[PDB]
Each structure stands twice: as C-alpha cells, then as structure tokens.
Design a protein around this ligand. Structure first.
Ligand SMILES: *[C@@H]1O[C@H](CO)[C@@H](O)[C@H](O)[C@H]1NC(C)=O
Ligand SMILES: *[C@@H]1O[C@H](CO)[C@@H](O)[C@H](O)[C@H]1NC(C)=O
Ligand SMILES: [Cu+2]
Length: 235
C-alpha cells in the first residue's frame, strides 16, 4: 500500500500534489482487476485543477509514501517492478495511447527489486521528459507488487498481482518535437492473465528469471532512475 505525494522537477519540489496535480485515489489500496477502468488512472480518474510545467530534458521525479511523507514508503514484502507510461491528456488514457518511458525490475548486481530501492530512495524515482509535441500529458507511474502473484485475481479475487497506479497532470512547454509520440498500449488492456510478469512466484523462482510485462520501452525515452533527488526533511 503506497501513494504519490507529489513530484520534483530538476531537483526542486513542486509541493503537495494530492487532488491538485495528481488524480489521487481516496486511499492506498491496490488495484487488482486487469479489466477494470481502475487500471487506467486508479479509482478516482477525473481532471484535477493544476498541471505541472516542465520542458523537454527535465528530470521529473515521483515521490511515493505509505501513510505520511518520507515514512516506510511501502512494505518490504511488496517486492516487484516499477514502470512509467505517458499519454496525451486529451485521450484521458483511453485507447492505445500509453507509451513506456521507464522499466526497472531486478538489479542483478545489488540483488534488489525496484521496490526495494524505492524504499532506500525515500519514495523517489525519476524520468527525463522526452522531446514530444508541447501540450498536456498524463504520466502514469505503476508499481507491481508480486507477493500474492502466484495466483490470478480472475481465478482468486483475494489474491494476485497488486497495482499501485498514479497519474500526474504534466504540461510540456518547451520541446523541439524531434521524437514525436508514437502509438501506445491500452490500460485496461495491455495486461492479461497470460502476460509474462503478471503471474510469478518470488519465493521459489529466481528473480534473475523475472520478465516484466511488455510493452518494451520506447527509443524516444531519455532514461531515468530510482534514487533520491531531494530531501523532504529540509522543508
Ligand atoms: C473487473 O472489472 C470489470 C470491468 O469493470 C467487471 O466486469 C468485473 O465485475 C470486475 N471483476 C471483479 C471480480 O470484480
Ligand atoms: C547498490 O547498493 C549500494 C549500497 O549498498 C549503492 O551505493 C549502489 O548505488 C547500489 N547500486 C545500484 C543502485 O545499482
Ligand atoms: Cu500493500
């Protein structure tokens, strides 16, 4: 159970975004139903009053929390991958609109899941704003927690993969549009029971064999990381 507090831009906190620039749900409960419209932007998908201004090449950082800011972030049991998608705001996340800008599952070297390191980074992970057409966008951050993913929610509704999904309203102002945004996948839609990554046993199978759900990351992506870029105690 985890939620988004806000975002930083080039290492500068934009302040609390909850129900302001984030289309926040009422609580930190996971989405589990792969055919639910909750898969798009979670349970309360509506326009919020603000959109964060960025320019192509900026670092956009998501800051997650559990109950209060800079807490335990998310339970350690929730080992799993982390991804970020983008889509034009006008779609409302409907249709084949979601392009992937980031994927992190398991780092072989450190023997750490993305989630594990998100805790160490005080809830912070980032992406670099790609050179797309100026305008309004939704950035969809998605954490998959695999601790009950040896079962499927369709077969057993009290188990299965857990999605923590947060959509942020972002206005790209300055971009040459040299990497115009391609076609994407649908949410709900891109993940099914058969999709690699959805069903997995993290207690028996080695993490080095885990394959995260497609699609793959777009060439137009300029990269990102899981790592603290800002100190919230300084505020
Ligand atoms: C999952 O969501 C779909 C679409 O909203 C709905 O038909 C179905 O009732 C849901 N399944 C469960 C078990 O809640
Ligand atoms: C691995 O762990 C060390 C600390 O134990 C950290 O300094 C290093 O950045 C980690 N490597 C990554 C994030 O790939
Ligand atoms: Cu949880």
């Amino acid at each position: 159970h985890t939620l988004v507090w806000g975002v930083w831009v080039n290492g500068v906190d934009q302040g609390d975004g909850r129900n302001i620039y984030i289309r926040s749900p009422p609580n930190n409960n996971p989405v589990k139903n792969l055919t639910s419209p909750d898969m798009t932007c979670n349970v309360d998908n509506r326009v919020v009053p603000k959109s964060v201004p960025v320019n192509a090449g900026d670092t956009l950082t998501f800051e997650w929390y559990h109950n209060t800011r800079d807490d335990d972030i998310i339970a350690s049991s929730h080992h799993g991958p982390i991804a970020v998608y983008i889509a034009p705001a006008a779609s409302n996340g409907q249709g084949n609109v979601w392009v992937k800008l980031f994927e992190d599952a398991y780092n072989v070297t450190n023997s750490t899941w993305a989630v594990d390191r998100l805790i160490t980074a005080h809830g912070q992970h980032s992406v670099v704003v790609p050179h797309v057409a100026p305008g309004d966008y939704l950035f969809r951050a998605e954490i998959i927690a695999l601790h009950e993913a040896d079962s499927l929610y369709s077969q057993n509704p009290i188990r299965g993969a857990q999605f923590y999904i947060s959509c942020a309203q972002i206005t790209i102002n300055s971009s040459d549009d040299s990497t115009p945004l391609p076609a994407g996948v649908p949410f709900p839609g891109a993940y099914t029971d058969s999709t690699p990554g959805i069903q997995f046993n993290i207690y028996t199978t080695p993490a080095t064999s885990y394959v995260a759900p497609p699609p793959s990351v777009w060439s137009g992506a300029l990269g990102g990381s899981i790592a603290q870029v800002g100190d919230a105690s300084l505020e």
